[PDB]
Design a protein around this ligand. Structure first.
Ligand SMILES: [Zn+2]
Ligand SMILES: [Zn+2]
Length: 236
């Protein structure tokens, strides 16, 4: 069983968000944690995994905590060599640390999901997979573009991040104060017909909780990059 399309009344409307859209833009504008062939070295709470990942670019962190849907998922990846890709946040990000030759025995940055096994998850000959994104504006297919990934089974999160990064730079998806769009959702259609979507707009109100918004990625949902179909539905 897949997820039914969004009803008219459940989609978040940007006009109803009176906070600063820049806080949403932040999460997707050339913003992401990426690591290759790493293994967790610790755990804060039962549902999370701690990794030693330092962004050689900007160097804002050396420790990354990613929270999963439950202990079973965490245990599945805990001792495997994995690849990581996701959107991180700092506000309300906390977890005690104990190590040396790094930070002051403290945390650094947080995220949800974003984990894929490294072994057997890449294409031969170092090929990259192009994934097509069809964008619909007011029920009209205005533009289509491609994003790439080197993973066979990639997290929906990675594809979502790359799709929004493009849209932010090419269509001003999110601006500092607001957005030119009223509603927007990204829909994934799998080869087996299964479908699911994420609301691209912040919940109504004057504040945006980045931690709460990103939590949707904690299911570590992955899709076959070779066959998945993606659609972005926007309205002005
Ligand atoms: Zn649990
Ligand atoms: Zn890999």
């Amino acid at each position: 069983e897949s997820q039914p399309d969004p009803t008219p009344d459940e989609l978040h409307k940007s006009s109803e968000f009176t906070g600063t859209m820049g806080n949403m833009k932040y999460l997707y504008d050339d913003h992401y944690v990426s690591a290759t062939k790493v293994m967790s070295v610790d755990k804060f709470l039962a549902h999370d995994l701690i990794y030693n990942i330092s962004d050689k670019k900007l160097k804002n962190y050396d420790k990354v905590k990613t929270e999963l849907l439950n202990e079973d998922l965490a245990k599945k990846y805990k001792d495997e060599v994995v690849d990581v890709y996701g959107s991180n946040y700092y506000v309300n990000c906390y977890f005690s640390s104990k190590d040396n030759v790094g930070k002051v025995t403290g945390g650094k940055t947080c995220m949800y999901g974003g984990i894929t096994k490294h072994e057997g998850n890449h294409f031969d000959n170092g090929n990259l997979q192009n994934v097509l994104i069809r964008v619909y504006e007011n029920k009209r297919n205005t533009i289509s573009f491609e994003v790439q990934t080197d993973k066979k089974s990639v997290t929906a999160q990675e594809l979502d991040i790359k799709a929004r990064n493009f849209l932010i730079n090419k269509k001003n998806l999110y601006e500092f104060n607001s957005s030119p769009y009223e509603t927007g959702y990204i829909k994934f259609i799998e080869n087996n017909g299964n479908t699911f979507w994420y609301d691209m707009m912040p919940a109504p109100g004057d504040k945006f909780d980045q931690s709460k918004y990103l939590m949707m990625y904690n299911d570590n949902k992955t899709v076959d990059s070779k066959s998945v179909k993606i659609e972005v539905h926007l309205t002005t």
